[PDB]
């Protein structure tokens, strides 16, 4: 009855490394938050 605003199911579409995940772009995890990688 109120206005629709996006939920977690809608908002997790924009959280991947890409927007349209294909077979090649499937192992791509999103980058780190401070963009700093472990030193390995």
């Amino acid at each position: 009855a109120r206005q629709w605003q996006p939920d977690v199911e809608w908002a997790e579409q924009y959280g991947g490394a890409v927007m349209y995940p294909t077979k090649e772009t499937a192992h791509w995890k999103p980058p780190p938050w401070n963009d700093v990688d472990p030193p390995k």
């Binding site: 908002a11 959280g15 490394a17 927007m19 349209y20 980058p31």
Partner: protein, 347 residues
């Protein structure tokens, strides 16, 4: 970084761009590009993480290859003309090599393969320096050699840049890669009007630098590097959602906004020269840029994505950031279209 060293390195980046802009000799153009690259590499490695080192390596390799092709074009001009004046080139081979070199330095497609990588790897401030200030020296040299630029080459580079920069940003959720494919499409727009009216090239460059500086200043003021973190801005500073709304609708080329100003004028100069198909394809292909801009406005301004609990702490703290010229650039990037005949000052 030590701030004296940061001041000296940024003044050296500026000095390299100015040495390209003011000099009448080809060796000094090349020295200015070398100084610009050499000084901007520590701006990219300001944070010392592997992504900045990777971005700096890719940027060094692309810009060094471009500067090699630039100096070969300069030496072939020296052979076929016996002189060094920065003007038209006296050989189509040197013209092709210098157009390739400047297209690599701009990151125009199909040499575009470094701009999303390098732009994602580096911070937002150095990404702003990359996408705005580094688009001034090759556009100077392109403004100076346009009697010798091959028409088919610069138009192929331009429309290929517009198409690839349109399709690239649709698959992105990272804001820096969005701004990088936006850069590719806009450099295609600038170089397509280069041989017809280079005043429109300078107009598109200035309006683009205003809008891109607005968007990076909004990203830095909100501390957002992804789409999904930009989507929390309504719960923290809701005026910033309005500013990114008006600036992203401006960057898509929508009237009555100032980002409609270059595009229209470019079409206005390409239909005079009996080219109807090419600015039509360019305008229709700019709808892809508009589509991922509209995606960012949906996630940020027009809807309200769910936030977290810890945002309640950030309600109690204001921004102490230097949002330098952000209201000025926000006004200039949105409300400048009634001042459209100001472009005559760029003649």
């Amino acid at each position: 970084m030590n701030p004296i060293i940061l001041i000296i390195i940024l003044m050296t980046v500026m000095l390299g761009t100015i040495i390209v802009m003011i000099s009448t000799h080809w060796l000094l153009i090349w020295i200015g590009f070398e100084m610009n690259m050499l000084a901007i590499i520590p701006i990219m490695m300001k944070k010392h993480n592997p992504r900045a080192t990777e971005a700096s390596t890719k940027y060094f390799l692309t810009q060094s290859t471009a500067s090699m092709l630039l100096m070969m074009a300069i030496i072939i001009n020296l052979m076929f003309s016996g002189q060094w004046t920065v003007m038209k080139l006296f050989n189509p081979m040197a013209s092709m090599l210098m157009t390739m070199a400047l297209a690599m330095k701009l990151g125009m497609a199909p040499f575009h393969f470094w701009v999303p990588e390098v732009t994602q790897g580096i911070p937002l401030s150095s990404g702003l320096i990359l996408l705005t200030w580094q688009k001034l020296a090759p556009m100077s040299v392109l403004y100076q050699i346009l009697p010798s630029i091959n028409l088919d080459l610069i138009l192929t580079l331009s429309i290929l840049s517009i198409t690839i920069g349109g399709w690239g940003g649709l698959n992105q959720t990272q804001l820096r890669k969005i701004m990088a494919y936006s850069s590719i499409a806009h450099m295609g727009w600038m170089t397509a009007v280069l041989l017809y009216n280079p005043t429109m090239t300078l107009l598109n460059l200035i309006i683009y630098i205003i809008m891109t500086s607005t968007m990076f200043t909004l990203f830095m003021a909100n501390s957002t590097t992804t789409t999904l973190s930009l989507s929390h801005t309504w719960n923290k500073a809701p005026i910033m959602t309005i500013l990114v709304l008006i600036t992203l609708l401006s960057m898509g080329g929508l009237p009555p906004l100032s980002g409609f100003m270059p595009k229209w004028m470019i079409i206005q100069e390409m239909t005079k020269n009996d080219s109807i198909i090419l600015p039509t394809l360019m305008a229709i292909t700019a709808l892809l840029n508009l589509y991922f801009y509209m995606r960012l406005t949906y996630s940020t301004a027009l809807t309200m994505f769910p936030s977290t609990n810890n945002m309640k702490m950030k309600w109690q703290f204001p921004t102490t950031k230097r949002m330098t010229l952000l209201p000025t650039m926000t006004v200039l990037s949105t409300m400048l279209l009634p001042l459209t005949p100001i472009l005559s000052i760029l003649e």
